[PDB]
Ligand binder design. Structure first.
Ligand SMILES: CNc1nc(Cl)nc2c1ncn2[C@@H]1CCCCO1
Length: 164
């Protein structure tokens, strides 16, 4: 069903996450972690304290799709297990040092063609697929985008709900 998903998305904030490569999104799905550039890291840390749920919606650049979405379960933290990110042209591990823990809500893909009817008020009502890494998505647009994804029947949202 969709009832527990709607409960998790209640009063959530949504952020677009753009990755330069598929390898880091696969690593993120396997390990439950994400790292971003310092400007977005500060934005996400502020949002984590302010909202019942912060939702990251992932899109690999040039893929024409979203690769899934996840809930932040922690603020960023330094040290800890070193994540072996594949680094873009000039993106040292120092610029990705903060690690957020995340709980995946959906690991299924959604092609951009299926979201063409959704526009983001916080990006000049451009289609929601358009936006820079870290772009915030307004509540109503973000909720409807997350409901567009195929159900991920391998995920049990019971444990996610207890962390709210
Ligand atoms: C493990 N996290 C990341 N992995 C990769 Cl490949 N790229 C990233 C990541 N976080 C931010 N970016 C941005 C996307 C816009 C252009 C500069 O890079």
């Amino acid at each position: 069903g969709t009832s527990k998903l709607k409960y998790v998305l209640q009063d959530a904030r949504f952020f677009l996450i753009k990755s330069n490569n598929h390898e880091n999104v696969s690593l993120a799905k396997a390990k439950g972690v994400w790292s971003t550039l310092p400007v977005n890291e500060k934005k996400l840390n502020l949002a984590f304290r302010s909202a019942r749920s912060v939702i990251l919606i992932f899109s690999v650049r040039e893929s024409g799709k979203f690769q899934g979405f996840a809930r932040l379960s922690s603020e960023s933290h330094h040290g800890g297990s070193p994540i072996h990110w594949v680094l873009p042209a000039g993106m040292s591990a120092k610029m990705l040092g903060g690690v957020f823990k995340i709980d995946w809500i959906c690991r299924r893909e959604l092609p951009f063609t299926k979201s063409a009817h959704l526009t983001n008020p916080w990006n000049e009502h451009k289609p929601v697929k358009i936006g820079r890494d870290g772009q915030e998505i307004e509540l109503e647009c973000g909720t409807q985008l997350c409901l567009l994804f195929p159900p991920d029947e391998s995920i049990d949202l019971y444990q996610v709900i207890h962390k709210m």
